[PDB]
């Protein structure tokens, strides 16, 4: 059925997504991208840990599913299912083709599988958790790394959870009333637009 992944490791072709031009494409093996306590608020999980690509490469949907399962299983076994929120940050949108499934005549292949095209420094998996749960989550990602080809780095983020703010700028914007909850994420205050709506949405805004 599946060829060894070495046959599809490199981004040799242009991106080949599902479209009105290729329609009989199978589904990706990965369907779930958010695991753990995905409904946790931003303040509950300050620590973010990334699995980062050191490769310009293609990762199959099968590898994404396997690594996701490995990390989830380990972290829920060691720290509990609600101690983290794991997010897979790459979606397989590139269709691989297979030819054999005469000779080189009419050799345009059929859809065979799906792969995500990742760059160098691209984040593959993100895990927001508490600080005390660092060594577990790292070990959860370090195992998931075995399911991937190429080199990946485990990098502890400078930022608060999945927010774009550092762990210090977030605290500054939080004690200043510029951050409100939005479920699992937050909304930040804007100094543009309707003044009354801005003031109503952020009542604790200590204006300067």
């Amino acid at each position: 059925a599946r060829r060894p992944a070495r046959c599809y490791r490199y981004c040799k072709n242009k991106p080949y997504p599902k479209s009105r031009y290729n329609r009989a494409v199978p589904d990706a093996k990965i369907r779930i991208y958010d695991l753990g306590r995905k409904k946790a608020t931003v303040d509950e999980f300050p620590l973010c840990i990334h699995l980062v690509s050191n490769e310009l490469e293609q990762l199959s949907s099968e590898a994404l599913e396997a690594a996701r399962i490995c990390a989830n299983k380990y972290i829920t076994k060691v720290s509990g299912r609600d101690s983290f929120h794991l997010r897979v940050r790459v979606h397989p949108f590139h269709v691989l083709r297979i030819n054999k499934m005469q000779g080189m005549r009419g050799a345009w292949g059929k859809p065979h599988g799906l792969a995500a095209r990742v760059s160098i420094g691209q984040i593959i998996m993100s895990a927001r958790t508490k600080d005390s749960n660092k060594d577990v989550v790292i070990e959860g990602l370090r195992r998931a790394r075995y399911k991937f080809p190429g080199q990946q780095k485990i990098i502890i983020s400078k930022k608060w959870g999945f927010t774009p703010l550092n762990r210090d700028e977030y605290i500054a914007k939080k004690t200043n009333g510029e951050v409100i909850d939005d479920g699992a994420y937050v909304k930040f205050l804007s100094r543009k637009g309707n003044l009354e709506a801005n003031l109503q949405q952020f009542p604790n805004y200590q204006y300067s």
Partner: protein, 292 residues
């Protein structure tokens, strides 16, 4: 339940029409067809007879188009008519004829084609085009620009058409839009057209209304009543005016009770001025503070 339509993406991708199309004033299709000149007649302009009707005024202008904007050659307005002896009904079909005749005579005076190309001096309502004189300059050619106004047989724009044609301008046209055109029998009843040229329809309304509804006659034809103008002497008001229009078609501007500077100073008092950046910043700060 339904999607809000006026999104920021709707405004971002919106292509506003031309400024004067969004005002609903210029038909740029027709304007392109009117203005564009044969490229081998290099800088020779096409001249338009712009005819516009307001609720109180008739505006007739002779215009040539340029890149920086249209340039007026001459202009005759209906409120100039009281100088020539027509004081009421400044939007008649006959007032349209008088304005067309006035603008034609004024333009020909400006050019110097007065003695040549006099026009139809004895208005009998016959269809006629200004024919060139052999061994002489061709008549001033002008094209009618009725703008957004609908083309109907009997419309007032073709009154200015007929007046300008009779005034000596060469304006290409056909007689099938004049009042008195029989569409079934494709000939022009020049008697009814001559009636319309000298206010015959208005005079007949005066006569027909006076003996049937005197109270409405008193309100509709007030100015005629206090001017002691009956139906039978309506025609002369136009008939003399034509002659007077031909006697001195030169433009006399209204003497201005105030100078340009006085007008500007008076008007500037009633014009709100934009707030300075600091003023609106202070307003925002105050509104924030009063929110606590």
């Amino acid at each position: 339940m339904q999607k809000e339509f006026r999104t920021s993406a709707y405004h971002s991708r919106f292509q506003t029409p031309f400024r004067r199309r969004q005002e609903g004033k210029t038909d740029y299709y027709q304007r392109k067809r009117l203005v564009t000149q044969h490229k081998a007649k290099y800088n020779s302009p096409k001249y338009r007879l712009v005819v516009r009707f307001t609720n109180k005024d008739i505006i007739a202008q002779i215009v040539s188009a340029h890149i920086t904007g249209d340039v007026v050659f001459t202009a005759a307005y209906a409120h100039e008519l009281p100088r020539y002896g027509i004081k009421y009904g400044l939007t008649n079909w006959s007032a349209a004829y008088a304005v067309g005749l006035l603008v034609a005579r004024r333009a020909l005076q400006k050019l110097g084609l007065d003695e040549t190309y006099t026009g139809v001096e004895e208005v009998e309502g016959e269809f006629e085009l200004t024919e060139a004189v052999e061994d002489g300059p061709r008549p001033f050619k002008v094209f009618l620009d009725i703008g957004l106004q609908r083309t109907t047989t009997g419309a007032r724009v073709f009154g200015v058409l007929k007046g300008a044609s009779d005034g000596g301008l060469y304006v290409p046209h056909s007689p099938n839009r004049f009042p008195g055109w029989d569409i079934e029998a494709e000939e022009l009843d020049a008697e009814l057209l001559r009636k319309y040229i000298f206010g015959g329809h208005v005079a007949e309304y005066m006569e027909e209304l006076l003996d049937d509804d005197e109270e409405k006659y008193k309100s509709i034809f007030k100015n005629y009543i206090e001017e002691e103008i009956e139906s039978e002497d309506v025609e002369e008001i136009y008939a003399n005016a034509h002659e007077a229009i031909r006697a001195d078609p030169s433009f006399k501007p209204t003497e201005k009770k105030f100078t340009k500077e006085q007008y500007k100073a008076e008007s500037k008092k009633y014009r709100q001025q934009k707030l300075t950046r600091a003023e609106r910043q202070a307003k925002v700060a105050k509104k924030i503070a009063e929110f606590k």
